[PDB]
Amino acid sequence: MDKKTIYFISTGNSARSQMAEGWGKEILGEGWNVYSAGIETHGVNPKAIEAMKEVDIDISNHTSDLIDNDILKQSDLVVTLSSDADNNCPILPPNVKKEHWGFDDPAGKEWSEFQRVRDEIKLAIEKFKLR
Ligand SMILES: *Sc1ccc([N+](=O)[O-])c(C(=O)O)c1
Ligand SMILES: [O-][Cl+3]([O-])([O-])[O-]
Ligand SMILES: [K+]
Protein backbone atom coordinates (compact mmCIF):
# COMPACT_ATOMS: atom_id res chain seq x y z
CA MET A 1 2.31 -2.92 -0.91
CA ASP A 2 0.00 0.00 0.00
CA LYS A 3 1.20 3.47 -0.70
CA LYS A 4 2.72 5.73 1.93
CA THR A 5 1.49 9.29 2.44
CA ILE A 6 3.59 12.44 2.02
CA TYR A 7 2.24 15.83 3.12
CA PHE A 8 3.94 19.03 1.88
CA ILE A 9 3.28 21.99 4.12
CA SER A 10 4.20 25.62 3.76
CA THR A 11 3.18 29.14 4.78
CA GLY A 12 0.54 29.11 2.10
CA ASN A 13 -0.72 26.44 -0.27
CA SER A 14 0.07 28.66 -3.24
CA ALA A 15 3.51 28.27 -4.85
CA ARG A 16 6.19 26.05 -3.28
CA SER A 17 3.72 23.52 -1.85
CA GLN A 18 1.62 23.47 -5.04
CA MET A 19 4.66 22.80 -7.23
CA ALA A 20 5.81 20.15 -4.74
CA GLU A 21 2.38 18.51 -4.99
CA GLY A 22 2.60 18.68 -8.78
CA TRP A 23 6.06 17.10 -8.96
CA GLY A 24 5.28 14.67 -6.16
CA LYS A 25 2.22 13.25 -7.90
CA GLU A 26 4.19 12.78 -11.11
CA ILE A 27 7.36 11.37 -9.55
CA LEU A 28 6.09 9.65 -6.38
CA GLY A 29 2.60 8.73 -7.59
CA GLU A 30 3.23 4.99 -7.88
CA GLY A 31 4.09 4.52 -4.22
CA TRP A 32 2.74 7.62 -2.50
CA ASN A 33 -0.47 9.52 -1.82
CA VAL A 34 0.59 13.16 -2.27
CA TYR A 35 -1.03 16.13 -0.53
CA SER A 36 -0.12 19.74 0.21
CA ALA A 37 -1.49 22.47 2.46
CA GLY A 38 -0.53 25.73 4.10
CA ILE A 39 -1.02 27.67 7.33
CA GLU A 40 -3.25 29.78 5.05
CA THR A 41 -4.49 28.99 1.53
CA HIS A 42 -4.12 31.97 -0.86
CA GLY A 43 -5.10 29.95 -3.92
CA VAL A 44 -2.82 28.45 -6.58
CA ASN A 45 -0.32 31.11 -7.66
CA PRO A 46 -0.82 31.98 -11.36
CA LYS A 47 2.95 32.01 -11.95
CA ALA A 48 3.29 28.61 -10.26
CA ILE A 49 0.72 27.25 -12.71
CA GLU A 50 2.60 28.71 -15.70
CA ALA A 51 5.94 27.40 -14.38
CA MET A 52 4.56 23.87 -14.10
CA LYS A 53 2.79 24.07 -17.46
CA GLU A 54 6.20 24.91 -18.91
CA VAL A 55 7.45 21.48 -17.80
CA ASP A 56 4.29 19.70 -18.96
CA ILE A 57 2.63 19.33 -15.55
CA ASP A 58 -0.91 20.55 -14.97
CA ILE A 59 -1.57 21.86 -11.47
CA SER A 60 -4.44 24.10 -12.59
CA ASN A 61 -6.92 21.67 -11.05
CA HIS A 62 -5.24 21.62 -7.63
CA THR A 63 -7.04 23.02 -4.59
CA SER A 64 -5.47 25.45 -2.10
CA ASP A 65 -5.96 23.77 1.27
CA LEU A 66 -5.44 24.30 4.98
CA ILE A 67 -3.61 21.77 7.15
CA ASP A 68 -5.99 18.85 7.74
CA ASN A 69 -5.14 17.03 10.97
CA ASP A 70 -6.89 13.93 9.62
CA ILE A 71 -4.32 13.77 6.81
CA LEU A 72 -1.43 14.83 9.05
CA LYS A 73 -2.20 11.96 11.46
CA GLN A 74 -2.15 9.54 8.52
CA SER A 75 1.05 10.87 6.98
CA ASP A 76 4.20 8.77 6.90
CA LEU A 77 6.24 11.84 6.06
CA VAL A 78 5.50 15.53 6.52
CA VAL A 79 7.78 17.88 4.58
CA THR A 80 7.81 21.54 5.61
CA LEU A 81 8.82 23.87 2.78
CA SER A 82 9.22 27.18 4.64
CA SER A 83 10.67 28.19 8.00
CA ASP A 84 7.26 29.61 9.08
CA ALA A 85 5.61 26.21 8.59
CA ASP A 86 8.45 24.32 10.27
CA ASN A 87 8.64 26.61 13.31
CA ASN A 88 4.87 26.44 13.85
CA CYS A 89 4.59 22.69 13.43
CA PRO A 90 3.31 21.26 16.77
CA ILE A 91 4.39 18.03 18.45
CA LEU A 92 3.34 15.41 15.90
CA PRO A 93 1.88 11.94 16.48
CA PRO A 94 4.61 9.36 17.31
CA ASN A 95 4.12 7.54 13.99
CA VAL A 96 4.74 10.60 11.81
CA LYS A 97 8.22 11.47 10.50
CA LYS A 98 9.12 15.03 9.57
CA GLU A 99 11.74 16.59 7.31
CA HIS A 100 12.34 20.23 6.48
CA TRP A 101 13.26 21.04 2.88
CA GLY A 102 13.27 24.82 2.86
CA PHE A 103 12.90 26.71 -0.41
CA ASP A 104 12.87 30.44 -1.10
CA ASP A 105 9.47 32.10 -1.39
CA PRO A 106 8.93 33.15 -5.06
CA ALA A 107 5.90 35.33 -4.25
CA GLY A 108 5.93 38.80 -5.78
CA LYS A 109 8.89 37.91 -7.98
CA GLU A 110 9.27 37.37 -11.73
CA TRP A 111 8.57 34.08 -13.58
CA SER A 112 12.30 33.41 -13.25
CA GLU A 113 12.04 32.90 -9.48
CA PHE A 114 9.18 30.44 -9.88
CA GLN A 115 11.27 28.58 -12.43
CA ARG A 116 14.28 28.36 -10.11
CA VAL A 117 12.28 27.11 -7.13
CA ARG A 118 10.27 24.81 -9.40
CA ASP A 119 13.44 23.05 -10.43
CA GLU A 120 15.00 22.98 -6.96
CA ILE A 121 11.84 21.29 -5.72
CA LYS A 122 11.93 18.89 -8.66
CA LEU A 123 15.50 17.88 -7.81
CA ALA A 124 14.67 17.40 -4.12
CA ILE A 125 11.68 15.16 -4.89
CA GLU A 126 13.57 13.13 -7.50
CA LYS A 127 16.43 12.46 -5.10
CA PHE A 128 13.94 11.55 -2.38
CA LYS A 129 12.46 8.96 -4.73
CA LEU A 130 15.93 7.61 -5.52
CA ARG A 131 17.07 7.15 -1.91
S1 LIG B 1 3.46 20.59 10.61
C1 LIG B 1 2.50 22.09 10.95
C2 LIG B 1 2.99 23.37 10.73
C3 LIG B 1 2.21 24.47 11.07
C4 LIG B 1 0.95 24.31 11.63
N1 LIG B 1 0.23 25.40 11.90
O1 LIG B 1 -1.07 25.32 12.45
O2 LIG B 1 0.77 26.68 11.59
C5 LIG B 1 0.46 23.02 11.87
C6 LIG B 1 -0.82 22.77 12.65
O3 LIG B 1 -1.21 23.56 13.51
O4 LIG B 1 -1.49 21.75 12.45
C7 LIG B 1 1.24 21.92 11.51
O1 LIG C 1 2.60 28.95 -1.01
CL1 LIG C 1 3.92 28.49 -0.56
O2 LIG C 1 3.96 27.01 -0.61
O3 LIG C 1 5.01 28.99 -1.43
O4 LIG C 1 4.21 28.94 0.82
K1 LIG D 1 -3.46 21.06 -2.02
PDB file of C-alpha atoms and ligand atoms in Angstrom:
ATOM      1  CA  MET A   1       2.307  -2.920  -0.906  1.00  0.00           C
ATOM      2  CA  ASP A   2       0.000   0.000   0.000  1.00  0.00           C
ATOM      3  CA  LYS A   3       1.199   3.469  -0.702  1.00  0.00           C
ATOM      4  CA  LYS A   4       2.718   5.735   1.926  1.00  0.00           C
ATOM      5  CA  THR A   5       1.493   9.286   2.436  1.00  0.00           C
ATOM      6  CA  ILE A   6       3.588  12.436   2.023  1.00  0.00           C
ATOM      7  CA  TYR A   7       2.244  15.832   3.117  1.00  0.00           C
ATOM      8  CA  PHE A   8       3.938  19.032   1.877  1.00  0.00           C
ATOM      9  CA  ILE A   9       3.284  21.992   4.119  1.00  0.00           C
ATOM     10  CA  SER A  10       4.204  25.624   3.761  1.00  0.00           C
ATOM     11  CA  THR A  11       3.183  29.143   4.782  1.00  0.00           C
ATOM     12  CA  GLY A  12       0.538  29.108   2.100  1.00  0.00           C
ATOM     13  CA  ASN A  13      -0.721  26.438  -0.268  1.00  0.00           C
ATOM     14  CA  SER A  14       0.071  28.663  -3.236  1.00  0.00           C
ATOM     15  CA  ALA A  15       3.505  28.267  -4.853  1.00  0.00           C
ATOM     16  CA  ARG A  16       6.187  26.051  -3.280  1.00  0.00           C
ATOM     17  CA  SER A  17       3.715  23.523  -1.854  1.00  0.00           C
ATOM     18  CA  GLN A  18       1.620  23.466  -5.037  1.00  0.00           C
ATOM     19  CA  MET A  19       4.658  22.803  -7.227  1.00  0.00           C
ATOM     20  CA  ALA A  20       5.815  20.151  -4.736  1.00  0.00           C
ATOM     21  CA  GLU A  21       2.384  18.512  -4.986  1.00  0.00           C
ATOM     22  CA  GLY A  22       2.602  18.678  -8.779  1.00  0.00           C
ATOM     23  CA  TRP A  23       6.064  17.101  -8.955  1.00  0.00           C
ATOM     24  CA  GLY A  24       5.276  14.674  -6.159  1.00  0.00           C
ATOM     25  CA  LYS A  25       2.219  13.248  -7.897  1.00  0.00           C
ATOM     26  CA  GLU A  26       4.187  12.782 -11.114  1.00  0.00           C
ATOM     27  CA  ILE A  27       7.361  11.371  -9.546  1.00  0.00           C
ATOM     28  CA  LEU A  28       6.093   9.651  -6.380  1.00  0.00           C
ATOM     29  CA  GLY A  29       2.604   8.729  -7.590  1.00  0.00           C
ATOM     30  CA  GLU A  30       3.229   4.989  -7.879  1.00  0.00           C
ATOM     31  CA  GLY A  31       4.092   4.516  -4.220  1.00  0.00           C
ATOM     32  CA  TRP A  32       2.744   7.620  -2.497  1.00  0.00           C
ATOM     33  CA  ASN A  33      -0.470   9.520  -1.817  1.00  0.00           C
ATOM     34  CA  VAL A  34       0.587  13.157  -2.269  1.00  0.00           C
ATOM     35  CA  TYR A  35      -1.027  16.132  -0.526  1.00  0.00           C
ATOM     36  CA  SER A  36      -0.120  19.745   0.214  1.00  0.00           C
ATOM     37  CA  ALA A  37      -1.488  22.475   2.464  1.00  0.00           C
ATOM     38  CA  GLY A  38      -0.526  25.733   4.102  1.00  0.00           C
ATOM     39  CA  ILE A  39      -1.018  27.674   7.332  1.00  0.00           C
ATOM     40  CA  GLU A  40      -3.246  29.778   5.047  1.00  0.00           C
ATOM     41  CA  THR A  41      -4.492  28.992   1.529  1.00  0.00           C
ATOM     42  CA  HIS A  42      -4.121  31.975  -0.856  1.00  0.00           C
ATOM     43  CA  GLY A  43      -5.099  29.946  -3.924  1.00  0.00           C
ATOM     44  CA  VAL A  44      -2.819  28.445  -6.578  1.00  0.00           C
ATOM     45  CA  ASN A  45      -0.317  31.106  -7.658  1.00  0.00           C
ATOM     46  CA  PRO A  46      -0.815  31.984 -11.363  1.00  0.00           C
ATOM     47  CA  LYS A  47       2.948  32.006 -11.952  1.00  0.00           C
ATOM     48  CA  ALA A  48       3.294  28.611 -10.260  1.00  0.00           C
ATOM     49  CA  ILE A  49       0.724  27.254 -12.712  1.00  0.00           C
ATOM     50  CA  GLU A  50       2.603  28.709 -15.699  1.00  0.00           C
ATOM     51  CA  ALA A  51       5.941  27.405 -14.385  1.00  0.00           C
ATOM     52  CA  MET A  52       4.564  23.873 -14.104  1.00  0.00           C
ATOM     53  CA  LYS A  53       2.793  24.074 -17.462  1.00  0.00           C
ATOM     54  CA  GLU A  54       6.198  24.906 -18.911  1.00  0.00           C
ATOM     55  CA  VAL A  55       7.451  21.480 -17.801  1.00  0.00           C
ATOM     56  CA  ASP A  56       4.289  19.705 -18.958  1.00  0.00           C
ATOM     57  CA  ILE A  57       2.633  19.328 -15.552  1.00  0.00           C
ATOM     58  CA  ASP A  58      -0.911  20.548 -14.972  1.00  0.00           C
ATOM     59  CA  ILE A  59      -1.570  21.858 -11.475  1.00  0.00           C
ATOM     60  CA  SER A  60      -4.436  24.100 -12.586  1.00  0.00           C
ATOM     61  CA  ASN A  61      -6.917  21.672 -11.047  1.00  0.00           C
ATOM     62  CA  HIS A  62      -5.240  21.621  -7.627  1.00  0.00           C
ATOM     63  CA  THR A  63      -7.037  23.022  -4.593  1.00  0.00           C
ATOM     64  CA  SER A  64      -5.466  25.449  -2.101  1.00  0.00           C
ATOM     65  CA  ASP A  65      -5.963  23.767   1.266  1.00  0.00           C
ATOM     66  CA  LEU A  66      -5.441  24.303   4.977  1.00  0.00           C
ATOM     67  CA  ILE A  67      -3.610  21.772   7.145  1.00  0.00           C
ATOM     68  CA  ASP A  68      -5.986  18.852   7.744  1.00  0.00           C
ATOM     69  CA  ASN A  69      -5.139  17.029  10.972  1.00  0.00           C
ATOM     70  CA  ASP A  70      -6.892  13.931   9.621  1.00  0.00           C
ATOM     71  CA  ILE A  71      -4.322  13.772   6.813  1.00  0.00           C
ATOM     72  CA  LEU A  72      -1.430  14.825   9.047  1.00  0.00           C
ATOM     73  CA  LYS A  73      -2.203  11.964  11.456  1.00  0.00           C
ATOM     74  CA  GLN A  74      -2.151   9.544   8.519  1.00  0.00           C
ATOM     75  CA  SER A  75       1.053  10.867   6.982  1.00  0.00           C
ATOM     76  CA  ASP A  76       4.198   8.765   6.902  1.00  0.00           C
ATOM     77  CA  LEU A  77       6.236  11.837   6.062  1.00  0.00           C
ATOM     78  CA  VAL A  78       5.505  15.529   6.524  1.00  0.00           C
ATOM     79  CA  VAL A  79       7.781  17.875   4.582  1.00  0.00           C
ATOM     80  CA  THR A  80       7.806  21.539   5.614  1.00  0.00           C
ATOM     81  CA  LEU A  81       8.821  23.867   2.780  1.00  0.00           C
ATOM     82  CA  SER A  82       9.221  27.182   4.636  1.00  0.00           C
ATOM     83  CA  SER A  83      10.667  28.193   8.004  1.00  0.00           C
ATOM     84  CA  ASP A  84       7.260  29.611   9.078  1.00  0.00           C
ATOM     85  CA  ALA A  85       5.615  26.206   8.593  1.00  0.00           C
ATOM     86  CA  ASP A  86       8.455  24.320  10.269  1.00  0.00           C
ATOM     87  CA  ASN A  87       8.644  26.608  13.314  1.00  0.00           C
ATOM     88  CA  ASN A  88       4.871  26.442  13.851  1.00  0.00           C
ATOM     89  CA  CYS A  89       4.588  22.693  13.433  1.00  0.00           C
ATOM     90  CA  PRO A  90       3.309  21.260  16.768  1.00  0.00           C
ATOM     91  CA  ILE A  91       4.389  18.032  18.449  1.00  0.00           C
ATOM     92  CA  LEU A  92       3.341  15.412  15.899  1.00  0.00           C
ATOM     93  CA  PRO A  93       1.878  11.944  16.484  1.00  0.00           C
ATOM     94  CA  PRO A  94       4.610   9.364  17.305  1.00  0.00           C
ATOM     95  CA  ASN A  95       4.122   7.536  13.988  1.00  0.00           C
ATOM     96  CA  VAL A  96       4.743  10.602  11.812  1.00  0.00           C
ATOM     97  CA  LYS A  97       8.220  11.469  10.504  1.00  0.00           C
ATOM     98  CA  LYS A  98       9.125  15.031   9.566  1.00  0.00           C
ATOM     99  CA  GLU A  99      11.742  16.590   7.307  1.00  0.00           C
ATOM    100  CA  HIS A 100      12.336  20.231   6.480  1.00  0.00           C
ATOM    101  CA  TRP A 101      13.256  21.036   2.882  1.00  0.00           C
ATOM    102  CA  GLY A 102      13.275  24.817   2.858  1.00  0.00           C
ATOM    103  CA  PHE A 103      12.902  26.715  -0.413  1.00  0.00           C
ATOM    104  CA  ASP A 104      12.865  30.440  -1.096  1.00  0.00           C
ATOM    105  CA  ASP A 105       9.466  32.103  -1.387  1.00  0.00           C
ATOM    106  CA  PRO A 106       8.933  33.152  -5.062  1.00  0.00           C
ATOM    107  CA  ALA A 107       5.903  35.332  -4.251  1.00  0.00           C
ATOM    108  CA  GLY A 108       5.927  38.801  -5.782  1.00  0.00           C
ATOM    109  CA  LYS A 109       8.887  37.907  -7.982  1.00  0.00           C
ATOM    110  CA  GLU A 110       9.275  37.366 -11.730  1.00  0.00           C
ATOM    111  CA  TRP A 111       8.573  34.077 -13.578  1.00  0.00           C
ATOM    112  CA  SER A 112      12.299  33.411 -13.252  1.00  0.00           C
ATOM    113  CA  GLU A 113      12.041  32.903  -9.482  1.00  0.00           C
ATOM    114  CA  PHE A 114       9.183  30.438  -9.875  1.00  0.00           C
ATOM    115  CA  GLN A 115      11.273  28.577 -12.434  1.00  0.00           C
ATOM    116  CA  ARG A 116      14.278  28.360 -10.105  1.00  0.00           C
ATOM    117  CA  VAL A 117      12.275  27.113  -7.130  1.00  0.00           C
ATOM    118  CA  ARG A 118      10.267  24.812  -9.403  1.00  0.00           C
ATOM    119  CA  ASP A 119      13.439  23.052 -10.431  1.00  0.00           C
ATOM    120  CA  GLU A 120      15.005  22.980  -6.962  1.00  0.00           C
ATOM    121  CA  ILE A 121      11.837  21.294  -5.718  1.00  0.00           C
ATOM    122  CA  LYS A 122      11.931  18.887  -8.663  1.00  0.00           C
ATOM    123  CA  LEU A 123      15.504  17.876  -7.811  1.00  0.00           C
ATOM    124  CA  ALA A 124      14.667  17.397  -4.124  1.00  0.00           C
ATOM    125  CA  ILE A 125      11.683  15.161  -4.888  1.00  0.00           C
ATOM    126  CA  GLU A 126      13.571  13.135  -7.499  1.00  0.00           C
ATOM    127  CA  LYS A 127      16.431  12.461  -5.102  1.00  0.00           C
ATOM    128  CA  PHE A 128      13.937  11.554  -2.377  1.00  0.00           C
ATOM    129  CA  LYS A 129      12.465   8.955  -4.732  1.00  0.00           C
ATOM    130  CA  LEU A 130      15.930   7.605  -5.524  1.00  0.00           C
ATOM    131  CA  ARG A 131      17.074   7.154  -1.907  1.00  0.00           C
TER     132      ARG A 131
HETATM  133  S1  LIG B   1       3.456  20.594  10.614  1.00  0.00           S
HETATM  134  C1  LIG B   1       2.496  22.092  10.953  1.00  0.00           C
HETATM  135  C2  LIG B   1       2.989  23.374  10.727  1.00  0.00           C
HETATM  136  C3  LIG B   1       2.205  24.473  11.067  1.00  0.00           C
HETATM  137  C4  LIG B   1       0.948  24.308  11.634  1.00  0.00           C
HETATM  138  N1  LIG B   1       0.230  25.400  11.900  1.00  0.00           N
HETATM  139  O1  LIG B   1      -1.072  25.319  12.450  1.00  0.00           O
HETATM  140  O2  LIG B   1       0.766  26.680  11.594  1.00  0.00           O
HETATM  141  C5  LIG B   1       0.461  23.024  11.869  1.00  0.00           C
HETATM  142  C6  LIG B   1      -0.825  22.765  12.655  1.00  0.00           C
HETATM  143  O3  LIG B   1      -1.215  23.561  13.509  1.00  0.00           O
HETATM  144  O4  LIG B   1      -1.487  21.748  12.451  1.00  0.00           O
HETATM  145  C7  LIG B   1       1.236  21.920  11.510  1.00  0.00           C
HETATM  146  O1  LIG B   2       2.597  28.954  -1.007  1.00  0.00           O
HETATM  147 CL1  LIG B   2       3.918  28.485  -0.558  1.00  0.00          CL
HETATM  148  O2  LIG B   2       3.957  27.010  -0.615  1.00  0.00           O
HETATM  149  O3  LIG B   2       5.006  28.990  -1.430  1.00  0.00           O
HETATM  150  O4  LIG B   2       4.209  28.941   0.816  1.00  0.00           O
HETATM  151  K     K B   3      -3.464  21.063  -2.019  1.00  0.00           K
END
